[PDB]
Amino acid sequence: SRVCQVTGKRPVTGNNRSHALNATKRRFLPNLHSHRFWVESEKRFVTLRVSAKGMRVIDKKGIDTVLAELRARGEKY
Template identity: 80%
Template structure:
């Protein structure tokens, strides 16, 4: 499963590990993803989403129905 937030679209980014001696090695910064089940009252069922912490905050503010409508408008099947 890819490390992509279904709400925000956050993906891993690359950067450097930097030691005290300033040696640099490449690394990946992964988003803070969690698999979470959300109850959708309109559909009377749970929807399982892979969301970042910021994605959960967006769902808290806007509501799961609006967020699901936005995801489905992008063409993602849930």
């Protein structure tokens, strides 16, 4: 499914309000991408389906630090 690895962002529902205020049920989708990040610990590449904002969490943190929470949550990175 469309679930971010780091942030955990999942699609949410809302209304597609028009100019006449007609409510139509839509779905907001996260900006997920399949990016492979270089990890200096294992000297390899780890591919993840993270969001674009999730990568902003990654670069401010450590790439090895964010994988610890993924390992703690029980995720196969």
